[PDB]
Homo-oligomer: A and B are copies of this chain.
Amino acid sequence: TAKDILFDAEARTKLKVGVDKLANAVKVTLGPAGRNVLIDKKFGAPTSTKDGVTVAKEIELVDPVENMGAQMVREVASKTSDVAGDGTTTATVLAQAIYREGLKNVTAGARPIDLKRGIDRAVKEVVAELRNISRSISGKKEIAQVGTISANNDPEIGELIAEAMDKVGKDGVITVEEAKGMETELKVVEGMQFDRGYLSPYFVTNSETMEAELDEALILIHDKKSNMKELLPILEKAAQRPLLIIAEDLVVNKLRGTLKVAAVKAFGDRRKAMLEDIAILTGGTVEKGYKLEQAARITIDKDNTTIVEGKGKQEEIKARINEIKGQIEKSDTEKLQERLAKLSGGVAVLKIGASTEVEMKEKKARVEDALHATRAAVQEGIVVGGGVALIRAAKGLAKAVADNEDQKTGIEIIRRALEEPLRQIVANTGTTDGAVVLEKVKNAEGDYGFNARTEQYENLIEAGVVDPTKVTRSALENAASVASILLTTEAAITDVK
């Protein structure tokens, strides 16, 4: 349809208004002192949330160009918590500061392309310095320590996450379920996980977690490919139980009528080898087959699908692992070992018990967050929390080389942006003296920093204030990307009113 087009600074200033509205709403919740935000509902009392992710999901602007920039930062900064599990709000605060000062220098006559080059070279050095000051996490004792800190000081949960990664490995599949009793226990079952998720967001059974869970579900494995009407006869045939259909190609009927079904993807000759393994696991049968005309739990994520507690014959399924094991000697061969590790590795299940359901769902939420944080701690390590690690990592900027003065400006844009998260931590405490608090932390060194929880200076590592290195480096990398994309945006196209 007809379009309106904005160019040059008129587009970038309009985009900046949206970035500011997104950031200014979410950043008040940043630190441990993060202040409440009220979200209106259609009827009844409004929702009060200190969660910066919950606030960002509610941000929509009436102006199209303002909404574009607001969705740019929102989509990029959301990817920080998709992998590292934390840092969405931090990435948004950084993105606002980087784009503000960057655009401010564009008005002064700085080339936007050289600012991006200088910003990129500055991030490479800060991310590297974040690794130099990062503490590696290896061994079951300190893995339990990180799991306990992310559990809000729960030694039972820290030992549970450490024991799960001990049996199934650091890269193993670990899932969190609800226990049938008061006691919390760990159970290692059989299963596998692949990167093919749901085909539509409407299959999601849980609004906030964006996951589709099917309990006591039957698996349908075919190897032959969607919208063909022949699927209507097969769908209701065995439906009486949720169903998992696996193919390469019932959206409304699940969200409107009564049906429990999930259909994910299943490339080339490699896809035919994967579906034969799920048959020996899920306990079912897989071109030499019919036409379109069983596990305890099936969880469907956006980027992942995990089959938990599939029922095979343990004597027959053990032979399938030995068939692929024999194919390794006569064999690149790296993909054959991947399929072996999925079948023989299993899935760790965390059964979370408690007194009452309100406590059991409360305790389960901490185990999932502590698990996600511990997974990121074993990979890239841990760094000092409270926004201090971004300030300490500024020392790496000395190694950043600037080919001209505009590039040196971009380095200083990142230099001033690294201080912004801590500035917002202290600002959420309600004090106007926060400029002094930033000066003490910056003039100090090491793990010395400000803890906004007790409002006292201390050693944050010993105090239990820590962030995964993956969280911090991803927040800066994501923010610098989205802000540099907007700095280089010369046109904004949108539909007419």
Cβ of A102 to closest chain B Cβ, rounded Å: 11
Q: Which segment, of A155-163, A222-230, A372-380, faces chain B?
A: A222-230
Asked if A433 contacts B431 (CB within 8 A), the reply is no
Number of interface residues of A (CB under 8 A): 85
Q: Which segment, of A42-50, A277-285, A310-318, A319-327, faces chain B?
A: A42-50
Q: Is A369 an interface residue (CB 8 A)?
A: no
Asked if B485 contacts A48 (CB within 8 A), the reply is yes
Asked if B58 contacts A46 (CB within 8 A), the reply is no
By beta carbon, the residue of chain B nearest A232 is B257
Asked if B485 contacts A36 (CB within 8 A), the reply is yes
Chain B residues lying within 8 Å of A15, measured Cβ to Cβ, are: 38
Q: Contacting A108 at CB < 8 Å: which of B65, B107, B227, B258? A: B107
Q: Is A490 an interface residue (CB 8 A)?
A: yes
Q: Contacting A267 at CB < 8 Å: which of B46, B267, B357, B432? A: B357
Q: Is A446 an interface residue (CB 8 A)?
A: no
Asked if B59 contacts A353 (CB within 8 A), the reply is no
By beta carbon, the residue of chain B nearest A491 is B37
- A interface, by DSSP: helix, strand, loop or mixed? mixed
Complex CA–CA separation, A443 to B494 (angstroms)? 42
Interface centre among A62, A412, A490, A496 (most CB of B within 10 A): A490
Asked if A107 contacts B109 (CB within 8 A), the reply is no
Q: Is A55 an interface residue (CB 8 A)?
A: yes
Which residues, 141 to 183 on A, are CB-close (under 8 Å) to B?
178-181
By beta carbon, the residue of chain B nearest A353 is B268
Q: Is A256 an interface residue (CB 8 A)?
A: yes
Q: Contacting A111 at CB < 8 Å: which of B75, B431, B493? A: B431
Asked if A68 contacts B46 (CB within 8 A), the reply is yes
Asked if A492 contacts B38 (CB within 8 A), the reply is yes
User: What number of copies of this chain does the assembly contain?
Assistant: 4
Q: Contacting A62 at CB < 8 Å: which of B2, B65, B67, B101? A: B2
Q: Which segment, of A21-29, A88-96, A462-470, faces chain B?
A: A21-29
Chain B residues lying within 8 Å of A71, measured Cβ to Cβ, are: 44-46
By beta carbon, the residue of chain B nearest A64 is B40
Cβ of A363 to closest chain B Cβ, rounded Å: 13
Cβ of A200 to closest chain B Cβ, rounded Å: 14
Interface centre among A46, A113, A230, A432 (most CB of B within 10 A): A46
Given contacts A108-B105, A181-B268, contact A493 B1 (CB under 8 A): no
Asked if B435 contacts A40 (CB within 8 A), the reply is no
Asked if B113 contacts A104 (CB within 8 A), the reply is no
Asked if A491 contacts B75 (CB within 8 A), the reply is no
Q: Contacting A435 at CB < 8 Å: which of B21, B61, B109, B436? A: B436
Q: Is A112 an interface residue (CB 8 A)?
A: yes
Given contacts A71-B45, A180-B269, A258-B229, contact A113 B39 (CB under 8 A): no
Complex CA–CA separation, A493 to B433 (angstroms)? 28
Q: Is A270 an interface residue (CB 8 A)?
A: yes
Asked if B492 contacts A113 (CB within 8 A), the reply is no
Chain B residues lying within 8 Å of A74, measured Cβ to Cβ, are: 45
Asked if A36 contacts B490 (CB within 8 A), the reply is yes
Q: Contacting A38 at CB < 8 Å: which of B39, B46, B112, B491? A: B491
Asked if A488 contacts B40 (CB within 8 A), the reply is no
Cβ of A440 to closest chain B Cβ, rounded Å: 10
Q: Is A430 an interface residue (CB 8 A)?
A: yes
Q: Is A60 an interface residue (CB 8 A)?
A: yes
Chain B residues lying within 8 Å of A75, measured Cβ to Cβ, are: 44-45
Asked if B2 contacts A61 (CB within 8 A), the reply is yes
Q: Is A461 an interface residue (CB 8 A)?
A: no
Q: Is A128 an interface residue (CB 8 A)?
A: no
**CB-defined A-B contacts under 8 Å, sample of 16:** A5-B59, A25-B491, A35-B112, A38-B68, A38-B493, A44-B71, A44-B75, A46-B71, A107-B107, A108-B108, A111-B432, A180-B269, A267-B360, A433-B435, A434-B435, A435-B439
- 10 A-B pairs with least C-beta separation: A229-B257, A180-B268, A40-B494, A435-B435, A45-B75, A111-B430, A108-B108, A37-B491, A28-B490, A35-B490
Other than the given A45-B72, A229-B257, 6 more pairs (CB < 8 A) read A40-B65, A101-B109, A113-B430, A181-B270, A267-B357, A433-B435
